[PDB]
Amino acid sequence: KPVVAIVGRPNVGKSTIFNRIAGERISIVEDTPGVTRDRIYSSAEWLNYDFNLIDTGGIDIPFLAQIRQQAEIAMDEADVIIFMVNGREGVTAADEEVAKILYRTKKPVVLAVNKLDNTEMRANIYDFYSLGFGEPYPISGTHGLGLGDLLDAVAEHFKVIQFCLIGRPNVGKSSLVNAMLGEERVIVSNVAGTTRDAVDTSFTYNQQEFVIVDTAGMRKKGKVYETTEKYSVLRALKAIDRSEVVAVVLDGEEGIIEQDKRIAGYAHEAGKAVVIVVNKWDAVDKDESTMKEFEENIRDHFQFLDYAPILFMSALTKKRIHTLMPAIIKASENHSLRVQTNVLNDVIMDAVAMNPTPSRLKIYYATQVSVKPPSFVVFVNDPELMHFSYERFLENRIRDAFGFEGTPIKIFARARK
Amino acid sequence: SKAYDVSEAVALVKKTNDATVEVAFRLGPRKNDQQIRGAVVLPNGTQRVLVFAKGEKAKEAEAAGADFVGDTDYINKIQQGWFDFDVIVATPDMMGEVGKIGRVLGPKGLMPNPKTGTVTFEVEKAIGEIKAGNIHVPIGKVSFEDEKLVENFTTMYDTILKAKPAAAKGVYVKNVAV
RNA sequence: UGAUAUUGAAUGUUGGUACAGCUUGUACAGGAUAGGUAGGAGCCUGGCAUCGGUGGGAUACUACCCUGGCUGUAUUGACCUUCUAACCCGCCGCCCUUAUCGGGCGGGGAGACAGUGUCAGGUGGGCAGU
Ligand SMILES: Nc1nc2c(ncn2[C@@H]2O[C@H](COP(=O)(O)OP(=O)(O)NP(=O)(O)O)[C@@H](O)[C@H]2O)c(=O)[nH]1
Ligand SMILES: Nc1nc2c(ncn2[C@@H]2O[C@H](COP(=O)(O)OP(=O)(O)NP(=O)(O)O)[C@@H](O)[C@H]2O)c(=O)[nH]1
DSSP: OOOOEEEEEEOOHHHHHHHHHHHOOOOOOOOSSOOOOOOEEEOOSSSSSOEEEEOOOOOOOOOOOOHHHHHHHHHHHEEEEEEEOOOTTTTHHHHHHHHHHTTTTTTTTEEEOOOOOGGGGGGGOGGGGGGGSOOBBBBBBTBBBTTTHHHHHHHOOOEEEOOOEEEEESSSSSHHHHHHHHSSOSSSOOSOOOSSEEEEEEEEEEEEEEEEEOOOOOOOOOOOOOSSSHHHHHHHHHHHHOSEEEEEEEESOOOOOOOOOOOHHHHTTOEEEEEEEEETTTTTTTTHHHHHHHHHHHHOOSSSSSSSOOOOOOOOTBBSSHHHHHHHHHHHHHSSOOHHHHHHHHHHHHHHHHOOOOOOOOOOEEEEESSOEEEEEEESSSSGGOHHHEEEEEEEHHHHHHHHHTSSEEEEOOOOO | OOOHHHHHHHHTTTTTTTEEEEEEEEETTTTTTOOOOOOOSSSSSOOOOEEOOGGGGTTTTTTTTOOOOOOOSOOHHHSSSSOOOSOOOHHHHHTTHHHHOOSSSSTTTTOOGGGOOOOOOOOOHHHHOOOOOOOEEEEEEEESSSHHHHHHHHHHHHHHHHHHOSSSSSSSSSEEOO
């Protein structure tokens, strides 16, 4: 499929153009550093029903070398490299520095000029012929002007389950993902906050395709009073809604932090399969009964989720990394499973017989409604008599009658009707 | 090792020869926003200026001293040929057309652009006055006298400084190479 | 855990910054794969030189700032290893004085550390308001 990439110095509204191409994916803010740290992928079409889009960060002379490397890598796969530049400020030395790479790149290049929001000063498309490229074009993300001609200029050169990953910042999420697909795809830095939004990639494993997304970490709500840079957290929360398997990552060197329990709450309340994951065993000791020290401690603190399997692996030394997916596939089935109506009812009155302590609440019927998560409805004389202690009791019996491992369960109650 | 004076270097670039005395000046991109690139008429001062005048503006262009104006479009004569001569100026109406239709001014340094005072409605006043962050400026000849290049470098430096770029902070002066 | 002040000297290591003086920047082509950025007015002191050249860049020589390095100059920083003079003694002797308070004068021990005043995370139902 065709590949198209956008490059240039920062603050030229590259991500703005990328978004109005389709939807709203990349975060759009106005500041010199607030650029997309790495490359992203998407799909597009204009009368060809087939195109792909790639967005990167700004290029200049903190960390900028990794962004430059990503921009260079994106220049490889792209068929045409839309090269967007400001119009109001004319040209710049950094523009020539950017143009040097394109000069050394033997691929077709289309030049575009942004910040042309009205007709009159649209006539400012001049002096860009010195760059050595073809005819420039006008575009404005605020009003979507000149889009058809630009897309025609691009066209003239025309030739599965999703699982997420969350956690508190600086626990190795980015290192874990790029040490798992085998290819440098996302950035890794010592300072917290390296990632700035969701990164999506697709891949096939054991003749099965998969989708993996990173979420740049999550910190406490109270102390997140940043300069709208926490606007990315909304993007991270969005990925959970589109994901169906959630991987929570905890550091092994550090103990269980209170914020980790809160983060795991969001996944549980979303009715999504969870697999608790811990990283960085290279720091703390690996020995006998050190397995159970954190294995037991997690159970004591993380009571609300017990179905989640516990996996240990360190991304730095790549120990037991290949064991992550075996957990994932098993969790995939249990989140979408139905049990027979006959069998499910037969188990219900066995539980209530040995515990005849429900006037007295009456159980009459039981069945399943949804596949994911497995919702069940029980017809009773009155749902007011239902007690949260007894409601939890029903869940344990169901979770013990069958496997139902690594997935939450919800029980609904209906009146006599 | 020694930085000479202005009154000594004009008499000494007589001796650095009929050659042309030119000035380099290192400016102080970061500052591209307030960059320093430009042209000004000169005091102590052969070109061939060809104009792209449109409408009535050709009628005052043929009497000021220009060599060839045109038949309102000779970019087709520019295509496959066109030994360009000295200087290309234009007017703010056909510039957009000449820019797109003309595809031979980028790496040749004659593309009309109204940032330089060369694309305007005053074509009669424009013919008569033309005849990494660095600026080059020809101020004159070897055969000029000692009092000519002093006013020439004074006018060009006052033009540079008159234009004290925004973000004036930090040193503005780095080097003068006569 | 971090800064900052209380807060010192010596040598050893030791970077950064600034000002200097020398070097590098690999273009099909092109005078050795010996830079962009303003170019075009010289040999014969062993050699051979001098236009110009598919070249976007040759200089029959006039003539600026960069980029990475190498040498000096100053600034400071980071440190180690010491010392001593603040700062600290719920250690000894003497005097206030008859006094397990306190304060002076001597020894000893620690010594730029700890302790103290203003700025980040976690901690932890530590304690409150709901
Ligand atoms: N007036 C105006 N402003 C625009 C237009 N397009 C973008 N902007 C402004 O430019 C700002 C920066 O754009 P953005 O897409 O965030 O660029 P970026 O995140 O730095 N990505 P990149 O560095 O690759 O260019 C936006 O916040 C917006 O205010 C436009 O057509 N008109
Ligand atoms: N000891 C150890 N260190 C690790 C491991 N994985 C990463 N690190 C280091 O710890 C830091 C974590 O980097 P990163 O993967 O970006 O963690 P993150 O910030 O939580 N992810 P993101 O960048 O997406 O926000 C980096 O400095 C990395 O070198 C690991 O398995 N063990």
